[model samples]
Target: GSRLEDAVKKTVAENPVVVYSKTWCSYSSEVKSLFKRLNVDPLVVELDELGAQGPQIQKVLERLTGQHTVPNVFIGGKHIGGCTDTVKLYRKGELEPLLSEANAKK
Candidate 1:
Protein backbone atom coordinates (compact mmCIF):
# COMPACT_ATOMS: atom_id res chain seq x y z
CA GLY A 1 0.00 0.00 0.00
CA SER A 2 2.72 2.41 0.89
CA ARG A 3 4.63 1.65 -2.28
CA LEU A 4 1.53 2.08 -4.41
CA GLU A 5 0.67 5.34 -2.78
CA ASP A 6 4.17 6.62 -3.36
CA ALA A 7 3.99 5.73 -7.04
CA VAL A 8 0.57 7.32 -7.41
CA LYS A 9 1.74 10.49 -5.72
CA LYS A 10 4.71 10.72 -8.03
CA THR A 11 2.57 10.08 -11.08
CA VAL A 12 0.05 12.80 -10.21
CA ALA A 13 2.75 15.26 -9.32
CA GLU A 14 4.60 14.77 -12.57
CA ASN A 15 1.69 14.75 -14.96
CA PRO A 16 -0.60 17.66 -15.74
CA VAL A 17 -3.51 15.30 -16.26
CA VAL A 18 -3.74 11.80 -14.82
CA VAL A 19 -6.33 9.06 -15.05
CA TYR A 20 -5.98 6.05 -12.76
CA SER A 21 -7.96 3.33 -14.47
CA LYS A 22 -8.54 -0.23 -15.50
CA THR A 23 -7.91 -0.94 -19.18
CA TRP A 24 -11.22 -2.72 -19.67
CA CYS A 25 -13.31 -0.29 -17.66
CA SER A 26 -15.83 1.57 -19.83
CA TYR A 27 -15.69 4.60 -17.61
CA SER A 28 -11.92 4.63 -17.99
CA SER A 29 -12.29 4.40 -21.75
CA GLU A 30 -14.72 7.29 -21.74
CA VAL A 31 -12.36 9.56 -19.89
CA LYS A 32 -9.45 8.59 -22.15
CA SER A 33 -11.53 9.34 -25.23
CA LEU A 34 -12.60 12.68 -23.85
CA PHE A 35 -8.99 13.75 -23.38
CA LYS A 36 -7.97 12.42 -26.77
CA ARG A 37 -10.82 14.30 -28.46
CA LEU A 38 -9.56 17.45 -26.84
CA ASN A 39 -6.02 16.72 -28.14
CA VAL A 40 -4.65 16.46 -24.63
CA ASP A 41 -2.31 13.59 -23.80
CA PRO A 42 -2.94 12.45 -20.27
CA LEU A 43 -0.96 9.96 -18.23
CA VAL A 44 -3.10 6.83 -17.82
CA VAL A 45 -2.51 4.03 -15.33
CA GLU A 46 -4.29 0.70 -15.66
CA LEU A 47 -4.45 -0.41 -12.07
CA ASP A 48 -5.95 -3.82 -12.75
CA GLU A 49 -2.75 -4.84 -14.42
CA LEU A 50 -0.81 -3.78 -11.40
CA GLY A 51 -1.65 -7.09 -9.69
CA ALA A 52 -2.36 -6.99 -5.93
CA GLN A 53 -1.50 -3.35 -5.80
CA GLY A 54 -4.57 -2.37 -7.81
CA PRO A 55 -7.03 -2.54 -4.91
CA GLN A 56 -4.54 -0.82 -2.68
CA ILE A 57 -4.27 2.01 -5.13
CA GLN A 58 -8.04 2.32 -5.24
CA LYS A 59 -8.18 2.47 -1.48
CA VAL A 60 -5.56 5.21 -1.46
CA LEU A 61 -7.53 7.02 -4.12
CA GLU A 62 -10.68 6.85 -1.99
CA ARG A 63 -8.74 8.38 0.85
CA LEU A 64 -7.49 11.13 -1.38
CA THR A 65 -10.57 11.98 -3.45
CA GLY A 66 -13.50 10.57 -1.46
CA GLN A 67 -14.27 8.34 -4.46
CA HIS A 68 -12.55 5.15 -5.56
CA THR A 69 -14.33 4.59 -8.85
CA VAL A 70 -12.64 3.99 -12.15
CA PRO A 71 -12.03 6.92 -14.45
CA ASN A 72 -10.57 8.53 -11.40
CA VAL A 73 -9.70 11.82 -13.01
CA PHE A 74 -7.12 14.28 -11.87
CA ILE A 75 -6.48 17.58 -13.57
CA GLY A 76 -3.77 19.96 -12.52
CA GLY A 77 -2.90 17.71 -9.60
CA LYS A 78 -6.44 17.65 -8.21
CA HIS A 79 -8.96 14.82 -8.06
CA ILE A 80 -12.13 15.53 -10.07
CA GLY A 81 -14.07 12.32 -9.41
CA GLY A 82 -15.24 9.67 -11.89
CA CYS A 83 -16.99 9.54 -15.30
CA THR A 84 -20.33 10.99 -14.15
CA ASP A 85 -18.75 13.94 -12.39
CA THR A 86 -16.35 14.52 -15.23
CA VAL A 87 -19.20 14.41 -17.73
CA LYS A 88 -21.20 16.83 -15.65
CA LEU A 89 -18.26 19.21 -15.60
CA TYR A 90 -17.90 18.77 -19.34
CA ARG A 91 -21.56 19.42 -20.03
CA LYS A 92 -21.47 22.48 -17.83
CA GLY A 93 -18.51 23.83 -19.90
CA GLU A 94 -16.12 23.58 -17.02
CA LEU A 95 -13.96 20.60 -18.02
CA GLU A 96 -12.39 22.25 -21.03
CA PRO A 97 -11.10 25.19 -19.06
CA LEU A 98 -9.51 22.97 -16.43
CA LEU A 99 -7.87 20.98 -19.20
CA SER A 100 -6.65 24.15 -20.80
CA GLU A 101 -4.86 25.14 -17.62
CA ALA A 102 -3.05 21.82 -17.58
CA ASN A 103 -2.21 22.05 -21.28
CA ALA A 104 -0.83 25.55 -20.92
CA LYS A 105 1.86 24.32 -18.57
CA LYS A 106 2.96 21.68 -21.02
Candidate 2:
Protein backbone atom coordinates (compact mmCIF):
# COMPACT_ATOMS: atom_id res chain seq x y z
CA GLY A 1 0.00 0.00 0.00
CA SER A 2 2.85 2.37 0.75
CA ARG A 3 4.42 1.62 -2.59
CA LEU A 4 1.12 2.20 -4.35
CA GLU A 5 0.75 5.48 -2.57
CA ASP A 6 4.20 6.52 -3.67
CA ALA A 7 3.41 5.66 -7.28
CA VAL A 8 0.15 7.53 -7.20
CA LYS A 9 1.81 10.52 -5.63
CA LYS A 10 4.47 10.50 -8.29
CA THR A 11 1.84 10.30 -11.04
CA VAL A 12 -0.11 13.29 -9.81
CA ALA A 13 3.03 15.33 -9.21
CA GLU A 14 4.51 14.61 -12.60
CA ASN A 15 1.47 15.67 -14.56
CA PRO A 16 0.21 19.23 -14.63
CA VAL A 17 -3.30 17.77 -14.47
CA VAL A 18 -4.30 14.19 -13.74
CA VAL A 19 -7.51 12.19 -13.65
CA TYR A 20 -7.86 8.68 -12.27
CA SER A 21 -10.81 7.07 -13.92
CA LYS A 22 -12.47 3.81 -14.93
CA THR A 23 -12.90 3.45 -18.66
CA TRP A 24 -16.57 2.48 -18.51
CA CYS A 25 -17.59 5.13 -15.99
CA SER A 26 -19.75 7.88 -17.46
CA TYR A 27 -18.65 10.40 -14.87
CA SER A 28 -15.12 9.70 -15.95
CA SER A 29 -16.15 10.29 -19.54
CA GLU A 30 -17.74 13.57 -18.59
CA VAL A 31 -14.61 14.70 -16.82
CA LYS A 32 -12.49 13.76 -19.80
CA SER A 33 -14.81 15.69 -22.09
CA LEU A 34 -14.67 18.62 -19.77
CA PHE A 35 -10.93 18.68 -20.12
CA LYS A 36 -11.31 18.33 -23.85
CA ARG A 37 -13.68 21.27 -23.97
CA LEU A 38 -11.11 23.30 -22.11
CA ASN A 39 -8.52 22.16 -24.65
CA VAL A 40 -6.41 20.72 -21.89
CA ASP A 41 -4.74 17.36 -22.41
CA PRO A 42 -4.66 15.99 -18.92
CA LEU A 43 -2.93 12.82 -17.84
CA VAL A 44 -5.80 10.34 -17.62
CA VAL A 45 -5.28 6.96 -15.99
CA GLU A 46 -7.94 4.31 -16.53
CA LEU A 47 -7.71 2.16 -13.45
CA ASP A 48 -9.98 -0.62 -14.74
CA GLU A 49 -7.58 -1.47 -17.55
CA LEU A 50 -4.55 -1.26 -15.31
CA GLY A 51 -4.84 -4.94 -14.27
CA ALA A 52 -3.85 -5.86 -10.68
CA GLN A 53 -2.78 -2.33 -9.75
CA GLY A 54 -6.23 -0.84 -10.23
CA PRO A 55 -7.77 -1.50 -6.82
CA GLN A 56 -4.55 -0.67 -5.06
CA ILE A 57 -4.42 2.67 -6.81
CA GLN A 58 -8.00 3.37 -5.83
CA LYS A 59 -7.33 2.60 -2.20
CA VAL A 60 -4.40 4.96 -2.26
CA LEU A 61 -6.60 7.59 -3.85
CA GLU A 62 -9.16 7.27 -1.07
CA ARG A 63 -6.46 7.74 1.49
CA LEU A 64 -4.90 10.66 -0.33
CA THR A 65 -8.03 12.62 -1.23
CA GLY A 66 -10.73 11.36 1.18
CA GLN A 67 -12.96 10.57 -1.79
CA HIS A 68 -13.26 6.94 -2.85
CA THR A 69 -15.20 7.71 -6.01
CA VAL A 70 -13.93 7.51 -9.57
CA PRO A 71 -12.70 10.33 -11.79
CA ASN A 72 -10.49 11.57 -9.03
CA VAL A 73 -9.22 14.82 -10.45
CA PHE A 74 -5.98 16.54 -9.60
CA ILE A 75 -4.49 19.77 -10.81
CA GLY A 76 -0.95 20.93 -10.16
CA GLY A 77 -0.71 18.06 -7.68
CA LYS A 78 -3.84 19.21 -5.84
CA HIS A 79 -6.86 16.98 -5.40
CA ILE A 80 -10.00 18.64 -6.79
CA GLY A 81 -12.61 15.94 -6.32
CA GLY A 82 -14.97 14.37 -8.91
CA CYS A 83 -17.14 15.36 -11.91
CA THR A 84 -19.80 17.22 -9.93
CA ASP A 85 -17.21 19.30 -8.19
CA THR A 86 -15.45 19.95 -11.45
CA VAL A 87 -18.72 21.02 -13.07
CA LYS A 88 -19.48 23.36 -10.23
CA LEU A 89 -16.06 24.93 -10.45
CA TYR A 90 -16.43 25.31 -14.20
CA ARG A 91 -19.92 26.76 -14.04
CA LYS A 92 -18.67 29.27 -11.52
CA GLY A 93 -15.95 30.25 -14.02
CA GLU A 94 -13.23 28.95 -11.78
CA LEU A 95 -12.03 25.91 -13.73
CA GLU A 96 -10.28 27.83 -16.48
CA PRO A 97 -8.15 29.91 -14.18
CA LEU A 98 -7.41 26.88 -12.05
CA LEU A 99 -6.27 25.01 -15.13
CA SER A 100 -4.26 27.97 -16.27
CA GLU A 101 -2.53 28.25 -12.93
CA ALA A 102 -1.71 24.56 -13.01
CA ASN A 103 -0.38 24.76 -16.54
CA ALA A 104 1.63 27.84 -15.73
CA LYS A 105 3.44 25.96 -13.00
CA LYS A 106 4.47 23.31 -15.49
Candidate 3:
Protein backbone atom coordinates (compact mmCIF):
# COMPACT_ATOMS: atom_id res chain seq x y z
CA GLY A 1 0.00 0.00 0.00
CA SER A 2 1.61 3.22 -1.16
CA ARG A 3 -0.85 5.20 0.83
CA LEU A 4 1.87 6.81 2.88
CA GLU A 5 2.10 9.85 0.69
CA ASP A 6 -1.58 10.51 1.13
CA ALA A 7 -1.28 9.93 4.83
CA VAL A 8 1.49 12.47 5.20
CA LYS A 9 -0.45 15.11 3.33
CA LYS A 10 -3.64 14.32 5.15
CA THR A 11 -1.98 14.42 8.53
CA VAL A 12 -0.43 17.79 7.84
CA ALA A 13 -3.59 19.20 6.43
CA GLU A 14 -5.77 18.02 9.26
CA ASN A 15 -3.51 18.92 12.14
CA PRO A 16 -2.72 22.42 13.25
CA VAL A 17 0.83 21.38 14.10
CA VAL A 18 2.72 18.42 12.77
CA VAL A 19 6.28 17.11 13.06
CA TYR A 20 8.11 14.53 11.04
CA SER A 21 10.73 13.07 13.35
CA LYS A 22 12.47 10.01 14.62
CA THR A 23 12.24 8.62 18.10
CA TRP A 24 15.97 8.75 18.80
CA CYS A 25 16.99 11.97 17.06
CA SER A 26 18.37 14.56 19.44
CA TYR A 27 17.08 17.50 17.49
CA SER A 28 13.63 15.98 17.40
CA SER A 29 13.49 15.78 21.17
CA GLU A 30 14.92 19.25 21.45
CA VAL A 31 12.19 20.82 19.38
CA LYS A 32 9.55 18.71 21.05
CA SER A 33 10.75 19.97 24.42
CA LEU A 34 10.42 23.51 23.16
CA PHE A 35 6.88 22.73 22.07
CA LYS A 36 6.22 21.46 25.56
CA ARG A 37 7.37 24.76 27.01
CA LEU A 38 5.20 26.61 24.54
CA ASN A 39 2.15 24.52 25.49
CA VAL A 40 1.54 23.43 21.91
CA ASP A 41 0.99 19.77 21.35
CA PRO A 42 1.83 18.63 17.85
CA LEU A 43 1.08 15.51 15.93
CA VAL A 44 4.54 13.99 15.77
CA VAL A 45 5.10 11.23 13.28
CA GLU A 46 8.04 9.12 14.41
CA LEU A 47 9.30 7.74 11.13
CA ASP A 48 11.72 5.18 12.46
CA GLU A 49 8.94 3.50 14.35
CA LEU A 50 6.86 2.97 11.26
CA GLY A 51 8.96 0.08 9.90
CA ALA A 52 9.13 0.18 6.08
CA GLN A 53 6.42 2.78 5.93
CA GLY A 54 8.68 5.14 7.82
CA PRO A 55 11.29 5.43 5.08
CA GLN A 56 8.61 5.84 2.48
CA ILE A 57 6.95 8.52 4.52
CA GLN A 58 10.26 10.32 4.92
CA LYS A 59 10.72 10.26 1.18
CA VAL A 60 7.32 11.79 0.71
CA LEU A 61 8.16 14.37 3.32
CA GLU A 62 11.39 15.27 1.55
CA ARG A 63 9.68 15.46 -1.79
CA LEU A 64 7.08 17.77 -0.37
CA THR A 65 9.18 19.85 2.03
CA GLY A 66 12.55 19.61 0.23
CA GLN A 67 14.05 18.78 3.62
CA HIS A 68 16.02 15.58 3.56
CA THR A 69 16.18 15.15 7.28
CA VAL A 70 14.28 14.31 10.35
CA PRO A 71 12.51 16.83 12.61
CA ASN A 72 10.76 18.38 9.66
CA VAL A 73 7.92 20.41 11.06
CA PHE A 74 4.73 21.87 9.64
CA ILE A 75 2.44 24.44 11.17
CA GLY A 76 -1.00 25.14 9.81
CA GLY A 77 0.03 22.86 6.94
CA LYS A 78 2.92 25.19 6.16
CA HIS A 79 6.38 23.74 5.89
CA ILE A 80 8.34 25.20 8.83
CA GLY A 81 11.65 23.46 8.23
CA GLY A 82 13.63 21.68 10.93
CA CYS A 83 14.83 22.30 14.46
CA THR A 84 16.75 25.52 13.79
CA ASP A 85 13.96 27.07 11.75
CA THR A 86 11.47 26.39 14.53
CA VAL A 87 13.80 27.60 17.30
CA LYS A 88 14.59 30.69 15.27
CA LEU A 89 10.90 31.45 14.99
CA TYR A 90 10.64 31.21 18.78
CA ARG A 91 13.59 33.48 19.46
CA LYS A 92 12.18 36.02 17.02
CA GLY A 93 8.94 36.00 19.04
CA GLU A 94 6.84 34.77 16.13
CA LEU A 95 6.41 31.17 17.15
CA GLU A 96 3.80 31.75 19.79
CA PRO A 97 1.55 33.79 17.57
CA LEU A 98 1.98 31.37 14.73
CA LEU A 99 0.82 28.59 16.99
CA SER A 100 -2.05 30.70 18.15
CA GLU A 101 -3.04 31.40 14.57
CA ALA A 102 -2.88 27.80 13.55
CA ASN A 103 -4.73 26.63 16.61
CA ALA A 104 -7.36 29.25 16.07
CA LYS A 105 -8.80 27.34 13.14
CA LYS A 106 -9.70 24.51 15.47
Candidate 4:
Protein backbone atom coordinates (compact mmCIF):
# COMPACT_ATOMS: atom_id res chain seq x y z
CA GLY A 1 0.00 0.00 0.00
CA SER A 2 2.96 2.31 -0.26
CA ARG A 3 3.85 4.34 -3.28
CA LEU A 4 7.53 4.84 -4.25
CA GLU A 5 7.51 8.19 -2.54
CA ASP A 6 5.86 6.63 0.48
CA ALA A 7 8.47 3.91 0.61
CA VAL A 8 11.22 6.50 0.40
CA LYS A 9 9.56 8.46 3.17
CA LYS A 10 9.19 5.31 5.22
CA THR A 11 12.86 4.58 4.82
CA VAL A 12 13.76 7.96 6.18
CA ALA A 13 11.29 7.52 8.99
CA GLU A 14 12.87 4.22 9.94
CA ASN A 15 16.16 5.93 10.55
CA PRO A 16 17.17 7.12 14.00
CA VAL A 17 17.17 10.84 13.31
CA VAL A 18 15.58 13.29 10.94
CA VAL A 19 15.84 17.07 10.93
CA TYR A 20 13.40 19.41 9.32
CA SER A 21 15.26 22.68 8.95
CA LYS A 22 15.38 25.95 7.12
CA THR A 23 18.38 27.01 5.04
CA TRP A 24 19.75 29.81 7.23
CA CYS A 25 18.94 28.55 10.73
CA SER A 26 21.88 28.87 13.06
CA TYR A 27 20.91 25.81 15.05
CA SER A 28 20.37 23.78 11.93
CA SER A 29 23.68 24.97 10.55
CA GLU A 30 25.38 23.94 13.76
CA VAL A 31 23.76 20.50 13.82
CA LYS A 32 24.52 19.93 10.15
CA SER A 33 28.09 21.00 10.68
CA LEU A 34 28.34 18.67 13.66
CA PHE A 35 27.00 15.81 11.59
CA LYS A 36 29.48 16.67 8.83
CA ARG A 37 32.32 16.56 11.32
CA LEU A 38 31.07 13.20 12.54
CA ASN A 39 31.02 12.10 8.86
CA VAL A 40 27.31 11.33 8.86
CA ASP A 41 24.79 13.39 6.99
CA PRO A 42 21.18 13.37 8.11
CA LEU A 43 18.19 13.46 5.81
CA VAL A 44 17.25 17.12 5.96
CA VAL A 45 13.74 18.20 5.11
CA GLU A 46 13.90 21.85 4.19
CA LEU A 47 10.51 23.36 3.58
CA ASP A 48 11.65 26.83 2.67
CA GLU A 49 14.63 25.48 0.82
CA LEU A 50 12.15 23.78 -1.47
CA GLY A 51 10.60 27.19 -2.27
CA ALA A 52 7.48 26.53 -0.24
CA GLN A 53 5.71 29.67 1.01
CA GLY A 54 3.33 28.50 3.73
CA PRO A 55 -0.24 27.20 3.19
CA GLN A 56 0.82 23.94 1.58
CA ILE A 57 2.97 21.43 3.49
CA GLN A 58 3.28 24.03 6.26
CA LYS A 59 -0.26 23.27 7.41
CA VAL A 60 0.48 19.58 7.57
CA LEU A 61 3.66 20.25 9.52
CA GLU A 62 1.88 22.49 11.98
CA ARG A 63 -0.82 19.93 12.54
CA LEU A 64 1.68 17.15 13.07
CA THR A 65 4.25 18.95 15.20
CA GLY A 66 1.87 21.61 16.52
CA GLN A 67 4.38 24.32 15.71
CA HIS A 68 5.54 26.16 12.61
CA THR A 69 9.16 26.40 13.57
CA VAL A 70 12.11 25.63 11.39
CA PRO A 71 14.89 23.31 12.47
CA ASN A 72 12.45 20.89 13.97
CA VAL A 73 14.39 18.02 15.42
CA PHE A 74 13.72 14.31 15.71
CA ILE A 75 15.79 11.51 17.20
CA GLY A 76 14.99 7.83 16.88
CA GLY A 77 12.11 8.94 14.72
CA LYS A 78 10.73 10.82 17.69
CA HIS A 79 10.48 14.57 18.03
CA ILE A 80 13.01 15.99 20.48
CA GLY A 81 12.20 19.64 19.83
CA GLY A 82 14.89 22.08 18.64
CA CYS A 83 17.98 24.21 19.46
CA THR A 84 17.76 24.07 23.23
CA ASP A 85 17.03 20.38 23.13
CA THR A 86 19.98 19.79 20.83
CA VAL A 87 22.24 21.63 23.25
CA LYS A 88 20.79 19.65 26.11
CA LEU A 89 21.60 16.39 24.40
CA TYR A 90 25.11 17.59 23.66
CA ARG A 91 25.65 18.59 27.26
CA LYS A 92 24.36 15.25 28.44
CA GLY A 93 26.95 13.57 26.19
CA GLU A 94 24.17 11.67 24.50
CA LEU A 95 24.24 13.32 21.08
CA GLU A 96 27.35 11.64 19.73
CA PRO A 97 26.30 8.22 20.90
CA LEU A 98 22.95 8.59 19.21
CA LEU A 99 24.63 9.79 16.05
CA SER A 100 26.87 6.77 16.07
CA GLU A 101 23.89 4.50 16.45
CA ALA A 102 22.16 6.27 13.60
CA ASN A 103 25.17 5.94 11.35
CA ALA A 104 25.84 2.32 12.12
CA LYS A 105 25.51 -0.03 9.14
CA LYS A 106 23.33 -3.06 9.47
Report the number of the highest-lDDT candidate.
Answer: 2
Candidate RMSDs in order: 1.9, 1.8, 2.1, 4.1
lDDT of 4: 0.65
Cα distance off (Å), candidate 2, residue 43: 0.6
> What TM-scores do the predictions have?
0.88, 0.93, 0.91, 0.68
Poorest stretch of ten by lDDT in candidate 3: 97-106
State how far residue 25 of model 4 sits from its true place (Å): 2.2
> What would the C-alpha RMSD of candidate 4 be, to one decimal place?
4.1
Q: Give the number of the best model, judged by TM-score.
A: 2
Query: What tens-digit string does per-residue lDDT give for candidate 2 at 1-106?
Result: 7887998899888988899999999999999998888888899899999999898888889999999999999988899999999899999998888889888232
- lDDT score, candidate 1: 0.85
Q: Tell me the tens digit of each residue's lDDT in model 1 across 1-106.
A: 7786787788887888898999999988998888887787888889999898788888999888888679899988888888888889999999989888766243
- In model 1, where do residues sit more than 4 Å from their true spots? 1-3, 104-106
Worst 10 residues of 2 by lDDT: 97-106
- Cα lDDT, model 3, residue 37: 81
**Candidate 4: which stretches are off by over 4 Å?**
1-12, 53-55, 103-106
CA error at residue 39 for candidate 2, angstroms: 0.3
lDDT per residue for candidate 3 within 31-99, as digits (tens), equals: 989888877789988989889888788788888889998799999888999999999998999988889
Error of 1 at 3 (Å): 5.1
